[PDB]
């Protein structure tokens, strides 16, 4: 099994009130669902990603990332977000991320296609 | 099938000489392998991601993203990159992306954990 | 005078313990000094930037940005950070930012030249 | 004088057709005007920034950054862009940047306040 397979697997909540439900595989796979509290989103969306299944043992976090394309049976926002970050274990376990949200645009509007931000996920709230 | 399922599936090359091999599923799945020409990388790494399988029909690109965790049997760089971007079809087809590369760090070094950049992928070179 | 000239001018502190001392001009100028609690930095560095001197009156924040090149008489880290964000007034006044920190690199290493992060500045601590 | 004071000072053009006119001071100051070919912009805007006036001599680029707040006598877009990058000298001299464009928003919309992109500036076109 992956070192933080147990630590990562489960339900996570960010500062916006969004819900991230993920299963970490022994090989490095992340699969689950994402529900955003904001934006052009309704209900759950598929996510997939990857994590470092053999992280450093020096107190460093565990690198990971995942993607959601914002299409499900209720809604299509013609966009995708990727979160890139690290898992930090312990009593106050966290996933600290930065994200890039790209919308489909014409070539003329591609300069304004991509939003950037940061989400912190915790096991409570 | 997804609108750009055929357009996205295949081999792509970026400005650094890296090779992105991807299969787009009808549902929105991206699976494949990534080989970086630079950095702490050797040979192929698993990737997974998502794309908008029903994009707009107004000339807009197709939003997508994917993740690579930089661990395989040869090397572990304790890091993950996510690419967020859009596919643009046509004779000069492209995937234009921005990326976030997070390394596992201690809490003290988390401020310097994340690199940002941009890759443009084409079907040739 | 600028709408938030009074609100912006002064001393600000971020989550890392860094100190941002700024004067906002009536025209949109930002001038001052920055002292980082982390990284390849010692003592104060010159900063300059700009802010929207006539922001919206709908409860929106006030857009602004500034730059520090990390050279002073004590130290040169061959790098520059830009912070881009907005000022939010009130009892819990804040400047919420995202930043890009570019280091001078060879062309071969340019892909790994730029760090990204986020700082929140407040009037206390 | 700064090592690349002469190299940086002048007129630069990016891939969008925007015009960046800058004077580099011996101390590290950047002052000038910016004219964007795209977005909510008309004519010239004030810019200010900083550069490393004593860069490395190992073939590395010269770190720099600057800010434009998008208010002038013609237009106010309640936003600011910061460019962070490096100057690379030679026959094909370039300023390679990444940028963050923050708009003033309500707290509810702050998650979608910031665009990210990349501009490459050259002395011709």
UniProtKB/Swiss-Prot annotation, chains A, B, C, D:
Q: Where along this sequence does the record place binding of biotin?
A: 34, 45, 83, 99, 111
Q: Does the keyword Cell membrane apply?
A: no
Primary location recorded for the protein, binned into one broad class: secreted
Q: Where is this motif: Cell attachment site?
A: 50-52
Q: Superkingdom of this entry's organism?
A: Bacteria
Cellular compartments annotated: Secreted
Regarding protein family, the annotation reads:
Belongs to the avidin/streptavidin family.
Q: What is this protein called?
A: Streptavidin
Organismal lineage:
Bacteria, Bacillati, Actinomycetota, Actinomycetes, Kitasatosporales
Parent-protein start and end of this portion: 38 to 158 of 183
């Amino acid at each position: 099994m992956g070192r933080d397979e147990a630590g990562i697997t489960g339900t996570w909540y960010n500062q916006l009130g969004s819900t991230f439900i993920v299963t970490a595989g022994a090989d490095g796979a992340l699969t689950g669902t994402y529900e955003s509290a904001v934006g052009a989103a309704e209900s759950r969306y598929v996510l997939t990603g990857r994590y470092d299944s053999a992280p450093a043992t020096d107190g460093s976090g565990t690198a990971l990332g995942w993607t959601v394309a914002w299409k499900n049976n209720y809604r299509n926002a013609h966009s995708a977000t990727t979160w890139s970050g690290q898992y930090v274990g312990g009593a106050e376990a966290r996933i600290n991320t930065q994200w890039l949200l790209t919308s489909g645009t014409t070539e003329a509007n591609a300069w304004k296609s991509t939003l950037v931000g940061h989400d912190t996920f915790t096991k409570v709230k």
